[PDB]
Design an enzyme around this catalytic site. Structure first.
Site, PDB file in Angstrom:
ATOM      1  N   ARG A   1       0.153   4.734   2.926  1.00 55.01           N
ATOM      2  CA  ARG A   1       0.074   4.404   4.327  1.00 55.01           C
ATOM      3  C   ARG A   1       0.495   5.600   5.210  1.00 55.01           C
ATOM      4  NH1 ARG A   1       3.820  -0.671   4.898  1.00 55.01           N
ATOM      5  NH2 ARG A   1       4.216  -0.367   2.616  1.00 55.01           N
TER       6      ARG A   1
ATOM      7  N   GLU B   1      -4.506   4.341 -10.869  1.00 56.47           N
ATOM      8  CA  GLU B   1      -5.367   3.187 -10.711  1.00 56.47           C
ATOM      9  C   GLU B   1      -6.461   3.182 -11.771  1.00 56.47           C
ATOM     10  OE1 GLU B   1      -6.352   1.786  -6.580  1.00 56.47           O
ATOM     11  OE2 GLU B   1      -5.694   3.848  -6.066  1.00 56.47           O
TER      12      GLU B   1
ATOM     13  N   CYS C   1       0.817  -1.185   0.000  1.00 56.00           N
ATOM     14  CA  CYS C   1       0.000   0.000   0.000  1.00 56.00           C
ATOM     15  C   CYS C   1       0.861   1.249   0.000  1.00 56.00           C
ATOM     16  CB  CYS C   1      -0.872   0.051   1.251  1.00 56.00           C
ATOM     17  SG  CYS C   1      -1.834   1.595   1.326  1.00 56.00           S
TER      18      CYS C   1
ATOM     19  N   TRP D   1      -8.978   6.749  -0.752  1.00 54.94           N
ATOM     20  CA  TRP D   1      -9.252   7.468  -1.996  1.00 54.94           C
ATOM     21  C   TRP D   1      -8.301   6.938  -3.061  1.00 54.94           C
ATOM     22  CZ3 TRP D   1      -7.887  10.117   2.590  1.00 54.94           C
ATOM     23  CH2 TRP D   1      -6.519  10.479   2.705  1.00 54.94           C
TER      24      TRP D   1
END
Ligand code: HEM
Ligand code: HEM
Ligand SMILES: CCN(CCc1cccc(F)c1)Cc1cccc(NC(=N)c2cccs2)c1
Ligand SMILES: CCN(CCc1cccc(F)c1)Cc1cccc(NC(=N)c2cccs2)c1
Ligand SMILES: C[C@H](O)[C@H](O)[C@H]1CNc2nc(N)[nH]c(=O)c2N1
Ligand SMILES: C[C@H](O)[C@H](O)[C@H]1CNc2nc(N)[nH]c(=O)c2N1
Ligand SMILES: [Br-]
Ligand SMILES: [Br-]
Ligand SMILES: [Zn+2]
Lengths: 407, 411
Positions: free
Chosen positions: A109, A283, A106, A278
């Site tokens: 973070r 992506e 991720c 979000w």
């Protein structure tokens, strides 16, 4: 045993000790690295509980205190008696924040401590799950000013009474195989779309049909629910320079909300734990729009731009990719829906890694996932050595429930 | 055992058995992955198994495994090892070994080409002037007026580690880098240290932005000596853009021949510490990395200024925009001058075809995803979606320490 990571752009070296606490295995051996593979009782539970409570009481500067020893004793008695135990609210919150903190794949973070945790452990039915979920969606969406949230349904018992959200994300678009032979909508969701249809959804059969929720309470057969359309914030995609872009008819949703993962805290397993933050712009614009197996819009866009598609070496795919990504970001920004670009997110993550090295002695990170899918080496993460290892509490993959559920 | 890899774009699943033949360590364990770490005097008893393993591989590839020739060769090597403590490769085995080290190079996207490698045997070389002449010849052969041909030149192997052959240059052709008193760099920042070494040793630096470095050559463990590659042998390409006519005025150029000279080649336990090798460029190496890394030429700002993009927020993607234009420029320029280059679409597509072929004929293809995926537009290349297994096979190319850190100066 103490390990160094170097940043090759900045020469900054960090020392990792945190990996020594690592418990779970990686997939790799000294003979073979599996870094690019997408997915590689009473007796068992007490150790896991102890390891967890030890780190919790450590975190609140009370390691080896009366209340630490008391709780260890209490949980121990409860496992002996009931075969399981219940987390105190404080523990549950801590555990969920730490599962995010430990998420090696991720990039977002830096935010990990700000997570809003909704305790849905009192939930009993699918209609209840639906209510909790709509509340989560509305809270997190916050009219475009997105806030990170997790909703945590009851923990696994004998494992024939699992709560599950059958959807892969709370909000996603349907995909329909065509007579034609092509796919309408998102090809990633064909199979789930079919499952919804066979359970009885009336599909509208368009390009961007928000899927219904398929919710399973207490190991029961799952049920369909439509998310109130009014709670699903969507963004029409336009380009700040290309007037024709809008005519592509592209849109996407504001709230990315993963719902198919399993949250493990102190050995306890939360099989329904939808969480949301979000989007990073890539992506949507790189993966959702441009993967050949997804919406795959590269060709149409390139054509509208009148680029020379004769030769790969004109870099027409690359030119089109950048424009699509500019449009995704501009559209979200124009409509005031929170989004982060890959430059800002990776810069955030490097700053976060430095914090974690300084404050915790490391940060597990998976380079294959952290480096964005476009413009890799122009982001700082590309040049950053990362150590990947598995800490608990954790988010884990789990089998899609339709392969498992018995009706 | 069998290991599977899946392509997530195509669902093509492949099965690896070749990983069973892997000997060397990765850096990873069951508890940690070191997959993104950049870098994660032999006895007779270690040497004979390494030789036997190699010779068994060679004899199998020529379908003579177990033949009288195979057996006589093993015994002959065995006898050479016990009496001289080392052994010499036959020319054929040197060729096979150098090609296989390329075939085995898990970070190399260009491996579809591996069996077409011109091998120059320089094991009779004794002096630095000897090495200069071998290297000139290699450059001229490989350059071939723009129609680049892959090649490797193999100097004498390590003996006692006190008599090593070494090219101190990291590549045969590379640009100098000069740290200025005000802290800015003139030329290429990656090469500052080595440029200072050259100057110390006597090189007269033109002190410009693209000065081709002199060769610094060490024969037989002696102090290295400086030589200038004849300029007429150094093919260069001025960089211009097909649409943007101001692009030429950035004053950019680059050399056509990428030629790695600082790696060590291991074949059957023998260590070739000077084994310069060359191929051709993938465009992103120059346009992404050499031009746009912050620690290299760092041209992104100046290009985006000249395209007049919005530079006030990273979210306009002005860097990504400038990045693509520069890469178009590099490929356009090389193509226009008939110098071999490959784009990252072509090269990754080829590599995927190579890798499937290898899985089918060889049982595997070790590949390092971190390095194979191009530094731009990663996911619109097929390799991004391809699972890979990284493991180490010999013969191999290995890193070795920079020679200025270890050399014993004679004076
Ligand atoms: C606040 C903004 C956040 C951003 C921008 C963000 C960014 C991302 C991105 C880009 C990915 C890669 C996903 C992909 O390529 O499909 C990811 C992975 C992940 N993130 Fe986040 N993240 C955020 C918040 C969260 C939150 C709130 C959680 C959980 C509480 C979370 C847990 C994860 C996990 C578990 C993964 C890996 C999923 C997998 O392996 O399949 N992140 N993050
Ligand atoms: C023929 C055209 C070739 C192309 C297009 C090509 C392409 C590349 C590229 C793009 C890289 C990554 C370089 C970087 O980021 O620094 C690379 C790595 C490498 N290739 Fe090639 N290659 C070619 C031929 C060769 C040859 C002839 C050899 C040796 C015989 C070779 C051995 C290697 C090795 C050992 C690496 C890894 C270097 C390291 O770990 O630092 N390749 N290849
Ligand atoms: C697109 C699919 N992503 C997982 C990828 C995956 C998972 C399982 C199997 C696969 F083949 C592929 C979902 C995901 C996971 C984590 C983060 C994100 N993106 C986000 N920005 C967030 C989602 C929730 C909080 S942040 C997406
Ligand atoms: C530029 C740096 N590359 C080595 C990378 C490296 C390794 C260790 C430390 C570093 F800072 C950088 C050199 C390299 C290696 C292999 C291939 C290429 N590129 C080519 N196209 C070829 C060179 C020779 C044959 S093909 C460049
Ligand atoms: C095979 C390879 O591991 C796979 O394509 C990965 C690569 N890196 C990724 N990185 C992110 N963030 N998301 C992904 O889905 C993937 N896919
Ligand atoms: C830390 C990280 O491993 C390092 O930046 C690597 C990433 N991938 C790479 N890939 C290639 N081809 N070349 C490189 O120099 C690098 N650098
Ligand atoms: Br972020
Ligand atoms: Br190639
Ligand atoms: Zn690994």
């Amino acid at each position: 045993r103490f390990l160094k990571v170097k940043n090759w752009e900045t020469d900054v070296v960090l020392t990792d000790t945190l990996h020594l606490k690592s418990t779970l295995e990686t997939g790799c051996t000294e003979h073979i690295c599996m870094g690019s593979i997408m997915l590689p009782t009473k007796d068992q539970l007490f150790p896991l509980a102890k390891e967890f409570l030890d780190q919790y009481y450590s975190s609140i500067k009370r390691f080896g205190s009366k209340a630490h020893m008391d709780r260890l004793e209490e949980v121990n008695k409860e496992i002996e008696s009931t075969s399981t135990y219940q987390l105190k609210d404080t523990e549950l919150i801590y555990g969920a924040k730490h599962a995010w903190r430990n998420a090696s794949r991720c990039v977002g973070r830096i935010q990990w401590s700000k997570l809003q945790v909704f305790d849905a452990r009192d939930c009993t039915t699918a209609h209840g799950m639906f209510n909790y979920i709509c509340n989560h969606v509305k809270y997190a969406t916050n009219k475009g000013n997105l806030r990170s949230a997790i909703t945590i349904f009851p923990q696994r018992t004998d494992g024939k009474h699992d709560f599950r959200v059958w959807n892969s994300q709370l909000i996603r678009y349907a995909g329909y195989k065509q007579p034609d032979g092509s796919t309408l909508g998102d090809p990633a969701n064909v199979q789930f779309t079919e499952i919804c249809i066979q359970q009885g959804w009336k599909a509208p059969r368009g390009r961007f049909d928000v899927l219904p929720l398929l919710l399973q309470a207490n190991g029961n057969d799952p049920e369909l629910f439509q998310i109130p359309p009014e709670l699903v914030l969507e963004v029409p995609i336009r380009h700040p320079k290309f007037d024709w872009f809008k005519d592509l008819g592209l849109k996407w949703y504001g709230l990315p909300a993963v719902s198919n993962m399993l949250l493990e805290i102190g050995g306890l397993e939360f099989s329904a734990c939808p969480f949301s933050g979000w989007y990073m712009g890539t992506e949507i614009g790189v993966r959702d729009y441009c993967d050949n197996s997804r919406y795959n819009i590269l060709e149409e866009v390139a054509k509208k731009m009148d680029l020379d598609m004769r030769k790969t070496s004109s870099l027409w795919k690359d030119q089109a990719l950048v424009e699509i990504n500019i449009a995704v970001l501009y559209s979200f920004q124009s409509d005031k829906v929170t989004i982060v670009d890959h430059h800002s997110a990776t810069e955030s993550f490097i700053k976060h890694m430095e914090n974690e090295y300084r404050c915790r002695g490391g940060c597990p990170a998976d380079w294959v996932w952290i480096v964005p899918p476009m413009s890799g080496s122009i982001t700082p993460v590309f040049h950053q050595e990362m150590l990947n290892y598995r800490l608990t509490p954790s988010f884990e993959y789990q089998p899609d429930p339709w392969n498992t559920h018995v009706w």
